[PDB]
Amino acid sequence: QVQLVQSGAEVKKPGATVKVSCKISGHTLIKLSIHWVRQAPGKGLEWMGGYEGEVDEIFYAQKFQHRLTVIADTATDTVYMELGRLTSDDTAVYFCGTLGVTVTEAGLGIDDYWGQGTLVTVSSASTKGPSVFPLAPGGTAALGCLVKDYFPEPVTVSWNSGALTSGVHTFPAVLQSSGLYSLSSVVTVPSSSLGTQTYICNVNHKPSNTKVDKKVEPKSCD
Amino acid sequence: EIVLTQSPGTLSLSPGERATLSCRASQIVSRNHLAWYQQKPGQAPRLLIFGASSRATGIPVRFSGSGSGTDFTLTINGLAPEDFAVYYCLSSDSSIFTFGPGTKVDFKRTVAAPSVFIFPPSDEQLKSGTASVVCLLNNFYPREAKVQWKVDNALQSGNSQESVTEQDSKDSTYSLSSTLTLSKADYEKHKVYACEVTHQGLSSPVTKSFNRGEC
């Protein structure tokens, strides 16, 4: 019944400041270790700093301490991280987690509670919904949808309103030199189904309220 | 400061096999402050081992750790399907924490060459002034693959991006896309668009290509 709940996704311009919260229920901050750990897309875990409730002390990674403040509110069981002078290097998922060990004569104590993560995107880009373009199709054919030029993450894709799942690969997005994201979603299907079965990709970019259903039709030389 | 390294970068093993993951510290660290975490895509990390060798509550008995000084290991004695994930060691001194770079444990299946498909830009996209050409490498193993773009035999460098799926939970393969971006003007000034794929499963590289304008 212990729960750590973080605040929602953030989009910030370079040079701005972000503040992320981590709220504890089912437990008390004064009995907990709460540390901030971030993860850039496709990269490893990086400790930023944290709070030890027993000693009421804050700790910082030297890499960040000039622009990072950690705030503990023992009255509301909430811990905050405030990171300034943001750049695109700070785009990452930020987690709060109970990293600290208590060393007593009776042994080692540790909790393992984690928040759900908070995505922070640092960019000059403006919110923009994607354009969806067809990737038109032996015994197996491939087809797909190109979901191009959107900001920020995330985007979801289904096929035939969720009825088509086997053989689908929706790729992780790439960040283009324009600062806009792009991804493709593909599916392999029987080539004998191309004249019969309709294939529609359902694309949802909630940050821009953009929903698109794109029918993908085969190419023929006949 | 403590600095942690981990080896191997990627460990490819089959279910039932014994995985040994290594963590090395730049200086002697307290055994009380050496831990191991598992992480799967889209999820927070999960504690496996603390104090170098103590198993966390609810962690299966096949996970163990040992070591002292600068050298520590995590052992998964008989991999289960749910164990394919990334593993991080973690150390601290005076509540200053440092994560190792992580070791990915992926599922070792038989080598499978990719099926390769090339997609020309749609006419709809071309009307906007840009052309994306997509090359798909489908359902291959292992993950390492090389894609080369050629436009009328000119090697394209710096104008493509790749993406790779996570290892499939049913057939343990990977898939990869490579997307070549050109202006509409450049696209219409050239004819042959080719994606050349190299992979250990392929005895020779596979080229998929189209002639602009062909059906």
Numbering used by the authors:
A (entry chain H): 1 to 52, 52A, 53 to 82, 82A, 82B, 82C, 83 to 100, 100A, ...
B (entry chain L): 1 to 27, 27A, 28 to 214
Paper text:
The RSV fusion (F) protein is a major target of neutralizing antibodies, including extremely potent antibodies that recognize prefusion-specific epitopes. RSV F initially folds into a metastable prefusion conformation, with fusion peptides buried within the central cavity of the trimer.
To investigate the conformation of site Ø and define the epitope on prefusion RSV F recognized by AM22, we determined the crystal structure of the AM22 Fab alone and in complex with the prefusion-stabilized RSV F variant DS-Cav1.
